[PDB]
C-alpha cells in the first residue's frame, strides 16, 4: 500500500490506459525513427546494480541501446553500476553522483518503501526525467509530480502466475517454505502476493519465510537454514533469480530432490538450470520490451508528445517439461535485441 495497483491505475486514468496501450503497440511494432531533430546529443545515466547472476539489468540496457540506434536517437551513456552487499545509503550516493552530471534522463532503481521521500524529494529538485525500473506500480503520494516513467515487468502478476501454476502441481495444505528478497518492496510484492493467493486458494500451510541478501549466497545459506529447522515442504518459494540458484545449490548439497523450486525471471541462467533439470519452474519476462519501452518513450518525449506514466511487459511460464523448441521460440521473443 501507498502504491496504485498496475491495472488499477490504468482504471483509474483512462488517458494513461491509451498512452500505455500506444507504447506497448509502439514496442511491438518496427522501428520508426525520429521525427524531429534535435539540437545535440542526449545525455543519459543509469544507476543500476552490477554483479548479478541475473541478466536483467544487462539486456535491459543493451535492447536500450540498440533501439535508441535504430530510432536515429544521438545519445550519451553514462552507466554506473552498484556493487553487491551495496547499503541503500551507498545506492543513493551513487545516485546523487549520479544527478552532479545534469543529464537529460535518469534510468535507476531503489527502493521506495525504504527511500520513498528520499525520491520524491529528487523528483522535486531536478530538471532530469526519472525512470524507475523494476517497478511497475505508481505511488500515491507523487500524484502532484510523477516521474517519466515506471517501467518493468508488474511484480504481482508474476507472483499470481507462480502461485496458479503452483496450486496445479500440489494438492491443498501442502507445506512450503519461502525465500524472500532482501527487506522491502521486492519482497511484499513478489512473496507477500504470492503467499496470500496461495493461502487463500488451496489452504497451503508456510512453514517459514526468511529474508536473504538478495545474493547466491545468501540464498544457498538460507536455503540451509530454512531446511534444517523445517525439512518437511513439498516446495520452496524463492522471490529472485540468485537466491533461486543458491538454494538450488543447497537443495543439491541435502540431498533433497523431493523439494520443488521456482525461478523468477526467466533469463539465461535460469533457462539454462531449468533445461538441465534444476529448477522446476520459472515465471519468464519477454525481457527487452523494456528496454525498448524506454528507448520508445524518449522518442516520444523528444518529438514533444505525451508519455505514459507505466508500462510493464508480459511473461511467459516455463517449466522444465517444456520442449526445446518452446524454449528456442521464447528466447526468440524475449530476447530479440539483446541476443
Ligand atoms: C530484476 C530482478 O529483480 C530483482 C533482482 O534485481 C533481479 O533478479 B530477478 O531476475 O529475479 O529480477
Known sequence: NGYWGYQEFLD?????????????????????????????????????????????????????????????????????????????????????????????????????????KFVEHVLDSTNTKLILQNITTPVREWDKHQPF???????????????????????????????????????????????????????FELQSAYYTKATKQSGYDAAKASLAKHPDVDFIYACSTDVALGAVDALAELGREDIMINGWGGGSAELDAIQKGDLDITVMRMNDDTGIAMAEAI?????????????????????????????????????????
Open 12 to 116: 483509474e486514468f483512462p488517458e494513461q490506459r491509451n498512452l500505455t496501450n500506444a507504447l506497448s503497440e509502439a514496442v511491438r511494432a518496427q522501428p520508426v525513427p525520429l521525427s524531429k531533430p534535435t539540437q545535440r546529443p542526449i545525455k543519459i545515466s543509469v544507476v543500476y546494480p552490477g554483479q548479478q547472476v541475473s541478466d536483467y539489468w544487462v539486456r535491459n540496457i543493451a535492447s536500450f541501446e540498440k533501439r535508441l540506434y535504430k530510432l536515429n536517437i544521438n545519445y550519451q551513456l553514462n552507466q554506473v553500476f552498484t556493487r553487491p552487499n551495496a547499503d541503500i545509503k551507498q545506492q543513493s550516493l551513487s545516485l546523487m553522483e549520479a544527478l552532479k552530471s545534469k543529464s537529460d534522463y535518469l534510468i535507476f532503481t531503489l527502493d521506495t518503501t525504504r527511500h520513498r
Open 149 to 203: 516513467l515506471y517501467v518493468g515487468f508488474d511484480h504481482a502478476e508474476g507472483s499470481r502466475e507462480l502461485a496458479t501454476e503452483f496450486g496445479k502441481f500440489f494438492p491443498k495444505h501442502t507445506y512450503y517454505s519461502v525465500l524472500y528478497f532482501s527487506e522491502g518492496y521486492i519482497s511484499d510484492v513478489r512473496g507477500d502476493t504470492f503467499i496470500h493467493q496461495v493461502n487463500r486458494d488451496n489452504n
Open 299 to 339: 522518442k516520444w518525449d523528444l518529438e514533444d508528445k505525451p508519455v505514459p506514466t507505466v508500462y510493464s511487459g508480459d511473461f511467459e511460464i516455463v517449466t522444465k517439461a517444456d520442449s526445446p523448441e518452446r524454449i528456442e521460440a521464447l528466447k526468440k521473443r524475449a530476447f530479440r535485441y539483446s541476443d
